[PDB]
Amino acid sequence: AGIPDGTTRRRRGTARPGSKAAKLREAAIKTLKRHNAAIKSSELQKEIEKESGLEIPNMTTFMQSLIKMYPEVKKPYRGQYILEGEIESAESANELEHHHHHH
Numbered sequence: 001a002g003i004p005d006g007t008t009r010r011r012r013g014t015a016r017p018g019s020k021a022a023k024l025r026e027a028a029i030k031t032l033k034r035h036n037a038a039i040k041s042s043e044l045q046k047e048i049e050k051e052s053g054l055e056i057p058n059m060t061t062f063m064q065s066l067i068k069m070y071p072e073v074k075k076p077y078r079g080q081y082i083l084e085g086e087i088e089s090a091e092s093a094n095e096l097e098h099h100h101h102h103h
Contacts (some may be wrong), residue, residue: 020054021065027052028066032073032083041079 072085
């Protein structure tokens with residue numbers, strides 16, 4: 001493919017795995033997995049930016065992209081988020097629950 005004259009040809013100085021967006025999204029998913037209760041937009045940003053070591057580029061665009069990638073991320077309130085959906089693996093159980101048992 002073609003490439004402009006107004007852009008660099010030594011692209012491997014920045015074109016690498018583990019990008020800003022990947023590390024920032026990983027910090028958001030770790031934050032949303034860690035809390036069992038809901039979290040505010042400000043609280044979620046503060047813990048994301050501390051965990052990733054990176055700034056959020058735009059909260060509206062980023063939180064929409066996070067929800068689009070991970071539909072288990074929900075919005076219980078205006079500027080308040082939670083994780084609810086089958087992203088986690090199913091738990092183990094004993095055969096006594098599958099067998100007939102008392103109340």
